[PDB]
């Protein structure tokens, strides 16, 4: 299989007998496949930066093992190059103490597995706009990857209302560095959708929300830039090209 950095992809495996699906010595979760009863899924996803050549995946069965072999693919994203190297910042003590404890406050979300769908069938756009800044858009030094974007931008004047792109758990509701007033939903197996820079909060950790409904306005904090919706996904562990996810993953639970 191939597969472009920086997304994800659904693994289909043999249901009977499966006992665990291995990358090296981490272990990769697996739930049913809604259409096909004698399968199950995985998601895989590959970094933006830095990811490998080449990645053998073990699917380890009662009496066999299936090797599954990924390429890595560049994809076509577009790229600019840095003409200072030192992407290295020095921020203040007092930014660089919040930046670093919400750091560690995500990554234990976003390493935290709901093993059951809080989805409700398909993801909707969380608001029915336009896209002004793609996904993966880099910063290259040496053809080094220094920076990408994360997620994707939808143009949105301050106070345009953004609504969940499915159903699940408020996991983020708060203001944090770099993303503004952010909110982040776990919407199980490991699937994340992440609304940044709002100028309003509607939501609480801890809220189930359904698809469609209110989560906050669109905004400017947190953003250089001007106003605008950054929509994120985070699945497999890592950020993924949102709109190609919400595509591969609708395929598949399409109502
Ligand atoms: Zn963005």
């Given at each position: 299989m191939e597969?472009?950095?920086?997304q994800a992809l659904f693994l289909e495996l043999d249901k009977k007998d499966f006992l665990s699906l291995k990358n090296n010595d981490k272990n990769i979760p697996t739930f049913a496949h809604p259409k096909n009863q004698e399968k199950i899924l995985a998601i895989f996803s590959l970094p933006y930066k830095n990811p490998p050549q080449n990645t053998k995946l073990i699917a380890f069965y009662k009496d066999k093992k299936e090797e599954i072999f990924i390429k890595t693919l560049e994809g076509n994203y577009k790229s600019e190059k840095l003409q200072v190297e030192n992407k290295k910042i020095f921020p203040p003590k007092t930014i660089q103490e919040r930046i670093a404890k919400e750091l560690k406050e995500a990554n234990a979300i976003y390493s935290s597995y709901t093993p059951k769908a809080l989805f409700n069938g398909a993801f909707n756009i969380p608001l029915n706009s336009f896209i002004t800044s793609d996904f993966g858009k880099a910063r290259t030094?040496?053809?080094?990857v220094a920076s990408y974007h994360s997620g994707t931008d939808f143009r949105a004047a301050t106070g345009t209302p953004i609504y969940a792109a499915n159903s699940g758990v408020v996991?983020?509701?708060?203001?944090?560095?770099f993303?503004?007033?952010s909110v982040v939903i776990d919407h199980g197996f490991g699937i994340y959708s992440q609304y940044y820079h709002?100028?309003?909060i509607?939501?609480?950790v801890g809220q189930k929300i359904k698809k469609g409904e209110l989560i906050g306005?669109?905004?400017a904090s947190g953003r250089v830039s001007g106003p605008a919706l950054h929509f994120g996904i985070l699945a497999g562990g890592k950020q993924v090209d949102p709109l190609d996810f919400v595509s591969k993953f609708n395929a598949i639970f399409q109502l």
């Open positions: 597969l472009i950095k920086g030094f040496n053809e080094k996991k983020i509701a708060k203001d944090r560095y993303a503004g007033n709002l100028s309003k509607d939501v609480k306005l669109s905004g």
